[PDB]
Amino acid sequence: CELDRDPEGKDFQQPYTSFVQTKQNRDGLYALLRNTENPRMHFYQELQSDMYCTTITDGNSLAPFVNWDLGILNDHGRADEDEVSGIAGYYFVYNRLNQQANAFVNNTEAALQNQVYKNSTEIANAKSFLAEGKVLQALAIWRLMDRFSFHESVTEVNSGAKDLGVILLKEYNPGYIGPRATKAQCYDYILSRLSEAIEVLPENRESVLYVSRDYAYALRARIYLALGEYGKAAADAKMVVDKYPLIGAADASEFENIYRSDANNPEIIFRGFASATLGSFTATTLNGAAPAGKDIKYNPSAVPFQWVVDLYENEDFRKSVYIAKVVKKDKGYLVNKFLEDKAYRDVQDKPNLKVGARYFSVAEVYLILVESALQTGDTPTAEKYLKALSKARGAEVSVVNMEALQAERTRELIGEGSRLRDMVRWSIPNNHDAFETQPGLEGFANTTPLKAQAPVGFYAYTWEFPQRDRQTNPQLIKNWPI
Amino acid sequence: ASTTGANSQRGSG
Amino acid sequence: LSTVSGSVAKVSSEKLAEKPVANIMDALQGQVAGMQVMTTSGDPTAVASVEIHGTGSLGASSAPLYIVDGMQTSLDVVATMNPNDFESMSVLKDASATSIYGARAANGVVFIQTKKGKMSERGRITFNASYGISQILNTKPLDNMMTGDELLDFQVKAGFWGNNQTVQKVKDMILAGAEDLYGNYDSLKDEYGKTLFPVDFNHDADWLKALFKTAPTSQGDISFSGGSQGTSYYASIGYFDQEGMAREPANFKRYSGRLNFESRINEWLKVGANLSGAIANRRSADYFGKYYMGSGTFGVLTMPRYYNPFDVNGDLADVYYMYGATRPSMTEPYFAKMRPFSSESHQANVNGFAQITPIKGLTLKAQAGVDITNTRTSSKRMPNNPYDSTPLGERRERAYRDVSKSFTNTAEYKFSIDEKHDLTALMGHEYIEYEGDVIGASSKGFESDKLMLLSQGKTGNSLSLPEHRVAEYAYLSFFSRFNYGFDKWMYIDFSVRNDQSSRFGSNNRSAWFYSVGGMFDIYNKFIQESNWLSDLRLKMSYGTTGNSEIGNYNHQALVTVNNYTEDAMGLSISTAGNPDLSWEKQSQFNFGLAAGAFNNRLSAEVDFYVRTTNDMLIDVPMPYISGFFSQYQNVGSMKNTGVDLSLKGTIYQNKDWNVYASANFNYNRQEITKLFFGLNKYMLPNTGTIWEIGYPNSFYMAEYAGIDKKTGKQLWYVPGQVDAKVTTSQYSADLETRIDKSVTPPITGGFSLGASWKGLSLDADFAYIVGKWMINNDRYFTENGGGLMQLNKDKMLLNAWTEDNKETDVPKLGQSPQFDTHLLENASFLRLKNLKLTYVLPNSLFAGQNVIGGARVYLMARNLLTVTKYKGFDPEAGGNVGKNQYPNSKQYVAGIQLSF
Amino acid sequence: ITPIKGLTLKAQAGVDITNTRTSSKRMPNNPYDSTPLGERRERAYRDVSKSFTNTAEYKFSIDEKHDLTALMGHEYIEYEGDVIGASSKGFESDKLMLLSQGKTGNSLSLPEHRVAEYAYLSFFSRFNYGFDKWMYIDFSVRNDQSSRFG
Amino acid sequence: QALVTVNNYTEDAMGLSISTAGNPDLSWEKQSQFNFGLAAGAFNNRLSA
Amino acid sequence: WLKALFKTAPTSQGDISFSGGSQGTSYYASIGYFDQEGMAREPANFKRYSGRLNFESRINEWLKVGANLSGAIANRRSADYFGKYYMGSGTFGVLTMPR
Amino acid sequence: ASTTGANSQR
Ligand SMILES: CCCCCCCCOCCOCCOCCOCCO
Ligand SMILES: CCCCCCCCOCCOCCOCCOCCO
């Protein structure tokens, strides 16, 4: 009587014996990432910026972030085996990525050190899958810091948290429950993971579906930028900024076909693999879209304030793709960046509004180089790359002066979770109670006041830790005060 | 549609 | 099966028969002391949550072992049986009486005995049939919701539609949007204004009628029982169909047969079988308990009354409209024919036994059986539907397989060692095996209802990965049990056992459990005869029991597939792992006393008990840093101290006029003893409950303190701060506190009355559950003026604090509600479980024709009376929260019975 | 049922259900195959055939030399069959061969699906004449109706 | 029946071909039996034909 | 090549059956086992696990009821290359394969 | 590898 029962479709965990076992674990790593560094996860913090008002259609889903309903945002989200969403979700998927990249990095170091690879080329590649896993850990921890550590500018906080990062765990350890690393602890782990990888990863990108040296240079320049290290951000930018060219569009139809194509956008540095049958998801929060036969109708739960619509020149290719005047019928704009990739339609004819997970496009690299060059007094190269990015978009900028950078960035990065961070760093408070709503939508997009004001240095621009992580871990210092 | 106003999850099922 | 030392309740046939729901454990709510049954959904298809003597564990199931004619069967398979074939149910609620059962005998065992034949001269044939209707059982929630233009004003004055808008501007705009939207559909473009009025500010749409209906229940059966020399037969076929009262479709119908057969073959052998099966179709409303715009009982409270799902004949349209909508929104009946569903379960249950009696005293009994269930289910998305996203349709076919083996063979040697010592010794072996399996296939792209074979789908970006899920477990057990009897007054029972489960690793799956017990006939030793006391017996037991009801594969450290591209597979870490995971070890001491007064026409049994759960299987939650959700561990401990007593007697036996009552009560204090990682408390996020060592599973919130009459703001009590109690308008999570309200209600009980006036008889069965509390998640929406201003609200928001309206208790408009005590409702209730008036035809009406011998007729009601303070539909329809409930139904039934 | 002397009413019914579940693999990593990738095909079958066939039969005698037997009856035969099957391919491990774990793209397939039903309605009669227990005649008429024809 | 089945040509639209020829008059096969029999028992029912 | 593609294979069967009854009622019950393995080395088999219960009872001078109940768990597999000409299989194989 | 040669069919 053997009462052993073991589950079908599962195998037991083991150390890496073969190169083919290692390569398979690296793929499972990138699979997770695709459902983690995912636009669906960054929409919450995009909706918390100064750009959105809720419509009459919302059902208290986007209202907590747009109207700063702190009483709901405190323990917002889910991360159980039925739903993974929100703040709780954002936190949970990245820790799994960090946990699961930890077990990949450690078990590749183990295999290399026991010479289980059978020749020098297997050996040489695992030293390279290793750098990739190092970048993944750097991304995982920094995304967790992006939302769960304070910017230096915050005023009143819970005592202790002003200098704390997130719980740093460098080993695959499910049972680990420790305290928060300090800010400099977390950030030195992030930058060193990245630096060690730029040493090993080859100069020129090998696959847009995997971590490349071009990618890490870009991700580091992003991370430097939010750290205020403008000189260092500009140095990693220039190392990637010219390797990816801008979309050659004559009108906004030539623009939209190229931009919306995961496959043909020459600006995409690093994306996750997606097909119509695997790795494609619908991202219809910003736009409210749904199919109707051969068509698409839109019922958004949130739409930009007029000042966002007024940001875009009328001939800006983005003003019909990133935002699109498709509210009511032709009456107002919604944020439409994540609308679709047609290549993922089950049927050519019928849209399903599915997209893929993109991780970095050279546009941001242009804006990281432009802002930093302005900060470091390098006007020529700040003006070069900003005139280029905007002219290729059909709306070249008159002057180059940070004010213009703040606008241009805001236009180009709409929908990607970037405005909330930018208003913290540019020291802009939330004027949502005072922005004009779009006139065309009178009666559908009305003003709703904040449930709590958001002035410069307000603590809730930084999220509280999930209530799971707090209740099970007395060694956790929370961010928000009493 | 659906209104996640907020569900207190049924932590006693 | 049960023993002289155990707490044992026995429920009779009549408590079981002809009940208009397929959930037979509902029929026991308030019949057994200490057994707390509760059905949280009126969905025909739902099965109750029984708990004997408290909640047994904070992570394992507390479900009793359910047993039918010797072998474990699931409630789901019990539901496919005809309960008019049950002779009796026996609840075994202490360590001595549950000593020969395993798996989870820590939760009590429910033993159902099906009828075996009565050895009469002519056999008794008997035919039962009844018809009846289900309704909703409480309407009060919508007594005080705003009317159509009552909320129109509310919305406009709150600024929801615009800054500078009048009611009529909005009224013009909404029906403007309904005519242009309807005006794009051939099937609607010129029915709006003729037969369709989707928006109508002059009539209030009956949203209760929109989403709920009266529904019927039908039952019948024939039963041939008879007998002869050594053989006994009971055969029956029968039919049941209970339709769902929610208009969202759900139903449970079964076509059943049963044959129970037992025969003495010779003075050395007795063989027997009891065989049963069913063809069964069940379907369930899968939207209840979630919040979807205009569905469920939430829909009937939340849909603005200016929205008409009806047409011009008062019948339910194909579609209603809501302002802003991209698409007309399908009503519930038109959704169903557009999203069809069927499922057939074939259920087979074969059961044999052999009883060799080779010498005086010895009984070799081998018993074995199968429990086969193949279920085959279909799902469609009807194509060419003009209110769907695409004209293209899909189809999903699944097939399910559950096979359950169980062998359980025994040797029983009873003898006598002199004239005052009776010993009965018995040991046995038992192997339980379960192997289950689910397969599912789906295609899409169909463009014809008549061309929808799965093989006819589009092939390309339209293809699907199949569905496939497997599951197996096994239990190996050796057990023993001895019964020593001194004189005819003193009884000792001893038992030891070993259980081994597939659900634990090889080095940790065995576990030993024991039990001792004694019954002492104080009457028949120390009171040879008394003129008023008839029965006085003292019971007492200690024992240990296992609980293994967890989830098959929760120990392995597993990897699964998680492909990143299409040309090579990928592997991700799947589970954390607990190499040490093993049995949960429960221990129960029971002190009993059973007494009979007058001429055992007035009986009672009181029992005191201490149920201790150590090595408790907690699915300990993990910090999200871990990259996991949970991991089972034998961690923590719990206590359930309590008493249960029951009594029954007759109040006026008058030779032709008997009056009978019976009552039963349990109280059970729960105390957690140990948590995990030395932690003293763990609040379970977004649930409003908390585990804290000193106390039981309690609720955990901020104390809501009303509003500031000077500002209109909400105020909450700050725990620990006082004056010479402190309020604040600044809400924070650190404002929350343990509340002296426990989640599982400590008091479970019921009573039942009965009189019989020569053939005419009335029985009433009551059941109560006090100390119950629930969060009315529904009121989070119906009562807030800070958000969801689409939704209908309670008319109390017409009172909202403003500068001109003070001296009100409803807060200013503009602030969202928090999950505090203002939603902790007292879900305690008395309920009238059934009223049955029956009239058995006179005996002499059948004195000339030797074909029919008797008849009975009856009127009956399930769930008419519900005394409770709860401001929601059903106070049973929830545990810790109540969201969008399918309320239990109220039934009216007429029935007839014939005997030949 | 036997209500009065001579006649015999017999009612009979039954089902004949067959649920059959079938599994098939093409084992991965075997070096004498075209690919190292594995395949798996699971099918499920269902045959349910019910039939009711109830009779009324009258036997009587009009003399010591004339035995008569009359019987007529009804019969409905139904058959409902059904076959469902799904398959995946691309597996790279003995232990990871759930259908739901296959490759998805050019490796996906259409399911297998087939249904078939038939039905029979019929009324029959049969008589028995017996004279002096040496001469015996039997006559019968019946009508059959099959779903297999228009 | 004289029937159509699906025969898709691409992946974005349904296709239809003629499936079966047909016989609206198809009906029962009508068989007929003339049977002349004889049974005989010999000796003391210890020999039958 | 005969030995390559054909083997000696086993057939196994067993059965117990309780018959009796007495009055107006009669029972015939049986459980049983059968396993026939196919002699072609190309795998093929028919095994069944059987049960049956037959029951008849006179209830009264007008009514007699009865059931016969039968079921089985069965596993069949068939040599599907036979009756076709494939290089190294079946009796064609055993005759045509160069020795 | 099948030898069609000739398959006089049944
Ligand atoms: C008119 C008389 C009523 C008879 C109804 C009987 C319905 C029985 O259904 C059970 C179906 O299960 C079939 C499996 O058969 C098992 C036989 O094995 C028993 C041998 O011990
Ligand atoms: C009134 C008729 C109700 C119909 C119920 C029929 C049950 C059909 O189930 C089919 C699947 O069950 C298989 C039975 O297995 C046979 C038992 O095997 C044990 C014999 O040794």
TrEMBL record, chain A:
Identify the residues that the record assigns to the RagB/SusD domain, covering every copy.
328-479
Spell out the SUPFAM superfamilies in the cross-references: TPR-like (SSF48452)
Protein name per UniProt: Lipoprotein RagB
Domain SusD-like N-terminal positions: 115-225
Q: Which InterPro entries match?
A: SusD-like_N (IPR033985), SusD_RagB_dom (IPR012944), TPR-like_helical_dom_sf (IPR011990)
Residue intervals passing through the bilayer: none
Q: Which organism is it from?
A: Porphyromonas gingivalis (strain ATCC BAA-308 / W83)
Family assignment from sequence similarity: Belongs to the SusD family.
A Gene Ontology term for the protein's cellular component: cell outer membrane
Location of the protein in the cell? Cell outer membrane
Q: Name one Pfam family in it.
A: SusD_RagB
Kindly state which keywords UniProt assigns to this record, in alphabetical order.
Cell outer membrane, Lipoprotein, Membrane, Signal
PROSITE patterns for this protein: PROKAR_LIPOPROTEIN
TrEMBL record, chain C:
Which residues are in the TonB-dependent receptor plug domain? 1-109
Provide the membrane topology annotation: Multi-pass membrane protein
* Taxonomic superkingdom: Bacteria
Q: Where does this polypeptide localize?
A: Cell outer membrane
Name any GO cellular component annotation: cell outer membrane
Domain TonB-dependent receptor-like beta-barrel span(s) in chain numbering: 374-717
Keyword Ribosomal protein in the entry? The reply is no
Output the Pfam families linked to this UniProt entry: CarbopepD_reg_2 (PF13715), Plug (PF07715), TonB_dep_Rec_b-barrel (PF00593)
Enumerate the UniProt keywords alphabetically.
Answer: Cell outer membrane, Membrane, Signal, TonB box, Transmembrane, Transmembrane beta strand, Transport
Q: Which family does it belong to?
A: Belongs to the TonB-dependent receptor family.
By what name is this protein known? RagA protein
Q: What is the protein's species of origin?
A: Porphyromonas gingivalis (strain ATCC BAA-308 / W83)
Q: What is the lineage of its organism?
A: Bacteria, Pseudomonadati, Bacteroidota, Bacteroidia, Bacteroidales
TrEMBL record, chain D:
The gene designation is ragA
- The species this protein belongs to is Porphyromonas gingivalis (strain ATCC BAA-308 / W83)
Instruction: State the source organism's domain of life.
Output: Bacteria
Task: Please give the family membership noted in the entry.
Answer: Belongs to the TonB-dependent receptor family.
- Where in or outside the cell is it found? Cell outer membrane
What protein name applies here? Answer: RagA protein
